[PDB]
Design a protein around this ligand. Structure first.
Ligand SMILES: N#Cc1cccc(NC(=O)N2CCC[C@H](C(N)=O)C2)c1
Ligand SMILES: [Zn+2]
Length: 139
């Protein structure tokens, strides 16, 4: 679990969005596993606007942060799950690092701010959904 709180927006994994997220929907994209909902309170986070390929992510299944080197956002095949059919997930960055399904929502940050959230992984890999291209998150 986990979310990004920026301005009057909450960014979560689309497969973990709640009834309240869907009732206050701003934008969603099944291909990216992202959903953004509106909030009444101002949020705690800043979004990175950069091309960093190194950063640090939070891993809930270890209660620890890990440094990673990650690939540039791209289209990557993701096997079928209870939430989606087998498909290509876009804007996804891969890294070598521990992750389990419940780690989705953990934030990846670089020196410029939030880069994305955990969305895929397994077998010593972790995949992050990028948010750096969503310029409207800041206005
Ligand atoms: N093992 C593992 C693992 C680690 C981090 C994350 C995951 N992700 C998942 O559990 N899913 C199932 C729900 C939809 C997700 C999607 N992006 O299509 C993929 C697995
Ligand atoms: Zn950066």
């Amino acid at each position: 679990s986990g979310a990004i709180y920026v301005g009057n927006y909450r960014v979560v994994n689309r497969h973990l969005a709640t009834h309240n997220d869907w009732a206050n929907l701003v934008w969603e994209d099944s291909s990216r596993d992202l959903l953004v909902s509106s909030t009444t309170a101002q949020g705690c986070d800043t979004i990175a606007r950069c091309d960093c390929q190194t950063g640090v992510y939070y891993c809930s299944s270890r209660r620890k942060h890990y440094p990673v080197s990650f690939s540039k956002p791209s289209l990557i095949f993701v096997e079928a799950s209870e939430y989606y059919p087998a498909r290509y997930q876009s804007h996804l960055m891969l890294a070598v690092g521990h992750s389990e399904p419940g780690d989705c929502g953990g934030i990846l940050r670089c020196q410029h701010g939030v880069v994305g959230i955990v969305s895929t992984g397994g077998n010593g890999l972790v995949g992050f959904a990028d948010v750096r291209d969503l310029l409207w998150l800041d206005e």
